[PDB]
Amino acid sequence: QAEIKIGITMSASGPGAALGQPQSKTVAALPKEIGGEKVTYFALDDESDPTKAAQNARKLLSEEKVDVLIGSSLTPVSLPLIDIAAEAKTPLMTMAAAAILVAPMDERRKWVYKVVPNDDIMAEAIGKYIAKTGAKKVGYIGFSDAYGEGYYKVLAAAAPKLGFELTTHEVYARSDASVTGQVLKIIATKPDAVFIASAGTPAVLPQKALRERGFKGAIYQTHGVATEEFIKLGGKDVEGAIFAGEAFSGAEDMPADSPFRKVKARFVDAYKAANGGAAPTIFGVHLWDSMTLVENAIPAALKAAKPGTPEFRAAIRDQIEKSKDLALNNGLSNMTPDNHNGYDERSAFLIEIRDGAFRLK
Numbered sequence: 001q002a003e004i005k006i007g008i009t010m011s012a013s014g015p016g017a018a019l020g021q022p023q024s025k026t027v028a029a030l031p032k033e034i035g036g037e038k039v040t041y042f043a044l045d046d047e048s049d050p051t052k053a054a055q056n057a058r059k060l061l062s063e064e065k066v067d068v069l070i071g072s073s074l075t076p077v078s079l080p081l082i083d084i085a086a087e088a089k090t091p092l093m094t095m096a097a098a099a100i101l102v103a104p105m106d107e108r109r110k111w112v113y114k115v116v117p118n119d120d121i122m123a124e125a126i127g128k129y130i131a132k133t134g135a136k137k138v139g140y141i142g143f144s145d146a147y148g149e150g151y152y153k154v155l156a157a158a159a160p161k162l163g164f165e166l167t168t169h170e171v172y173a174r175s176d177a178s179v180t181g182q183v184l185k186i187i188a189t190k191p192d193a194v195f196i197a198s199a200g201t202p203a204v205l206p207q208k209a210l211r212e213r214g215f216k217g218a219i220y221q222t223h224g225v226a227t228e229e230f231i232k233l234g235g236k237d238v239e240g241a242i243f244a245g246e247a248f249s250g251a252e253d254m255p256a257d258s259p260f261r262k263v264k265a266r267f268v269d270a271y272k273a274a275n276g277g278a279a280p281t282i283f284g285v286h287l288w289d290s291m292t293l294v295e296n297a298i299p300a301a302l303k304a305a306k307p308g309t310p311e312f313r314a315a316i317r318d319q320i321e322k323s324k325d326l327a328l329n330n331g332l333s334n335m336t337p338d339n340h341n342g343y344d345e346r347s348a349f350l351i352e353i354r355d356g357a358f359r360l361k
């Protein structure tokens, strides 16, 4: 009989690498037995490319007949996987951020779960903070994709009532070498602050370009930057950046017995043991937390059916939907039939880069 099989596609190369590489390194830390059954992981790089991710998913689903699919790392790469997983009646744990991946619910997103808090929650929280600082004019640059646009649309809708105006809607593609034209346009609007909607190492470019061209005001980013690689590459230019993000990023500033510190230690300890003592970045935890949900669902699913059958996959899908009051590294998660993300505003923590580390603001 087939053991439990988990397929993973992640953006281990391409402009998503700072997200997918940590995920690739987390695979070796994942549990090799659950509910008394062996678990085998099949991990594939999708190169930050939606076409390759779809190919990976179809191979994992049709050839390996995986019980659960996990991925991808990025929103554009993950979007096509929704239909593929639903058609295959296989749960998909996406590791990307945009709300559209699971919300609003529909007959396909019934098959999809999402541990990273929906970007609209984060956008609302950062918008409120920006308003509180007294900023009245806020520049904007973000990725020309559904991740970036999810930030722009929520900020733009909230701006009027918050009491500031978005002075631009500049965009760039993740691999672009330059954003000089966009940054010059932003600077010409003489804003009080600038918002950047980006992720991974590409997020450094617009912030450095703004600083190099004389912008001295506040710069806000997103939880796409919550990797120490961003701090290292960005240096003094990213000092002081603020974003709305996850408990994981603020955990060192929470009480010692906080559940968030406990769930972080479990991940960090396992990751270090599998990776020669190297500390993980947050993006690996999106794989880890996804597997927490899957692991929690498997024992009940095993009472219903054997691994490798549609009935087992359906039981996993049914069970994750019932998960309640669960502290993940990503926040306090409560799944429902209509909410396959599981978070509210209590999941949004304001993070600041201070002295080269992520801190609670």
Ligand SMILES: O=C(O)C(=O)c1ccccc1
Binding pocket: 019, 073, 074, 075, 076, 095, 096, 097, 098, 116, 147, 198, 199, 200, 223, 224, 225
């Ligand atoms: O969703 C994405 O495209 C993305 O860049 C991201 C940002 C933060 C956490 C997970 C994915």
